C-alpha cells in the first residue's frame, strides 16, 4: 500500500492520470500518475481530441463537470449488511492502497471474505497467564459457608 501511495504522488506539472499501476511505475518519461478516479479519467478521455477551451462558458462547464465527477468518485460507497449492522464500504478502497485488488470488485471480496482480510497480520492473540486459586477446609455453618 505504501508503494501505491507513493505512486499517487508526482513532482512534475504536466502529468496525466492512469489506472495502470505497472504502467505508471514503468513509465520512463515519468508523466503518468496513478489514480483511482475512474469518472474523472473517463471524462478527460471523452473530452480528449476536441475543440480547445477558449470561452468562459466552456471553462465554466469544464470546471463544473470536473468537480461533479470528482465528487461522485471520491464519495462512492455501498451499504452492505455486516454482523454488527450496516456498513457503508468505500468502493475505491481496493484501488488505492492495493488490498483485495485481485479482480471483480472490492466490495464483492470484502463481503465474501471478512473484515479481517484488510489487515496483513492476523492471529496475533495470546492467552494471558491465568492464576485462579482454588477455595482454601475448616467447618462452618450454612450462612458462613454461603457468604464465603
Amino acid at each position: 500500500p505504501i508503494n501505491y501511495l507513493q505512486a499517487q504522488n508526482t513532482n512534475n506539472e504536466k502529468f496525466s492520470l492512469s489506472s495502470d499501476f505497472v504502467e505508471v511505475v514503468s513509465s520512463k518519461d515519468k508523466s503518468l500518475v496513478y489514480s483511482f478516479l475512474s469518472n474523472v479519467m473517463f471524462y478527460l478521455d471523452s473530452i480528449k481530441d476536441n475543440s480547445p477551451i477558449d470561452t468562459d462558458k466552456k471553462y465554466y462547464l469544464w470546471l463544473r463537470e470536473i468537480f461533479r465527477n470528482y465528487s461522485f468518485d471520491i464519495t462512492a460507497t455501498q451499504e452492505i449488511n455486516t454482523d454488527c449492522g450496516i456498513n457503508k464500504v468505500v468502493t475505491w478502497f481496493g484501488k488505492a492502497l492495493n488490498i483485495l485488488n485481485t479482480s471483480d470488485s472490492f466490495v464483492e471480496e470484502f463481503q465474501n471474505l471478512g473484515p479481517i482480510s484488510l489487515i496483513n497480520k492476523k492471529e496475533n492473540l495470546s492467552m494471558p497467564i491465568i492464576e485462579i486459586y482454588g477455595i482454601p477446609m475448616l467447618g462452618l455453618p450454612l450462612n458462613d459457608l454461603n457468604e464465603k
Binding site: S71, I74, T75, C84, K88, V90, F93, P115, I116
Partner: peptide, 24 residues
C-alpha cells in the same frame, strides 16, 4: 468533498475494526 470522503472512510474502517473484534 475530500473531508466527506475522509470521514466516510473513517466510519467504514472503525466499524470494520469493531466487527473484527466481534467476529475474530
Amino acid at each position: 468533498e475530500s473531508q466527506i470522503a475522509i470521514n466516510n472512510i473513517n466510519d467504514f474502517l472503525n466499524k470494520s475494526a469493531i466487527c473484527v473484534f466481534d467476529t475474530n
